[PDB]
Amino acid sequence: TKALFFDIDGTLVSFETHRIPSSTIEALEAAHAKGLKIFIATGRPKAIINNLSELQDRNLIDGYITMNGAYCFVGEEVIYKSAIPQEEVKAMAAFCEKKGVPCIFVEEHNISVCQPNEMVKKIFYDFLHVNVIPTVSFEEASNKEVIQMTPFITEEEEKEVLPSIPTCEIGRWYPAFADVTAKGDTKQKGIDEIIRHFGIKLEETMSFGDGGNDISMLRHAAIGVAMGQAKEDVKAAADYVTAPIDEDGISKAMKHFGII
Numbered sequence: 001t002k003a004l005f006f007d008i009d010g011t012l013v014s015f016e017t018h019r020i021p022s023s024t025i026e027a028l029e030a031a032h033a034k035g036l037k038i039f040i041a042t043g044r045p046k047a048i049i050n051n052l053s054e055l056q057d058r059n060l061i062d063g064y065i066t067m068n069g070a071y072c073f074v075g076e077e078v079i080y081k082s083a084i085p086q087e088e089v090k091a092m093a094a095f096c097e098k099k100g101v102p103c104i105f106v107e108e109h110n111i112s113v114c115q116p117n118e119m120v121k122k123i124f125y126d127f128l129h130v131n132v133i134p135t136v137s138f139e140e141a142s143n144k145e146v147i148q149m150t151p152f153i154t155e156e157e158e159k160e161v162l163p164s165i166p167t168c169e170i171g172r173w174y175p176a177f178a179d180v181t182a183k184g185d186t187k188q189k190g191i192d193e194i195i196r197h198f199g200i201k202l203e204e205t206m207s208f209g210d211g212g213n214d215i216s217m218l219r220h221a222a223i224g225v226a227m228g229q230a231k232e233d234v235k236a237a238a239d240y241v242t243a244p245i246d247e248d249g250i251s252k253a254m255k256h257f258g259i260i
């Protein structure tokens, strides 16, 4: 194994404590010293990655896959970025508008929210301490080149709009919102973009995840690891199920594979 891909929330950072376990930091320091490249693979836009300062201050991250693979970069170099078909951006906007539900629209250098409600303030601010996202109208947000949109819709509502965003990927790990990206843009695409830059082969990758939006990279990586507390469809997509995050699941999996 030469490249490791880690989802953030529920894989590196505990939803319960909001911290990265000490054994995870120790395991990544050991893998780093042995030459393994360590990559983040998150549905979060770079703008709101505010919980990795411990890995970042240790300079342990070699590259970032953000917005579920639609925005990837290594250092200061953007190696891959896509945008959602404008008509599908308009369709989702129209849908959220009709339904009276919030929706975040993320651009390369801007992030906005349309019709924010308590679910938005609670989840992103009170819970994840994310910076207040500026409010804008559905009309304005959907006139920009959007890399990822995050409608706060349930799985049932989702079924309602699928028909109007026919080529988009939808990744969901929570019942209250999903991340929508262009055709083919999932963490699996992010792995491919990243490894090409380092001359690393797919058979030399390992991914770690706990959510629905991790299923494609768990299947795609040579070895996929699901966190012990992930739902069963996430575990079924993996080659190995490790312990829950707060039971040293990352360090245990890495030890089990002989990486450290």
Ligand SMILES: [Mg+2]
Pocket: 007, 008, 009, 010, 011, 173, 209, 210, 211
């Ligand atoms: Mg997660």
Ligand SMILES: [Mg+2]
Pocket: 218, 219, 220, 221, 222, 223, 224, 238, 239
């Ligand atoms: Mg696999």
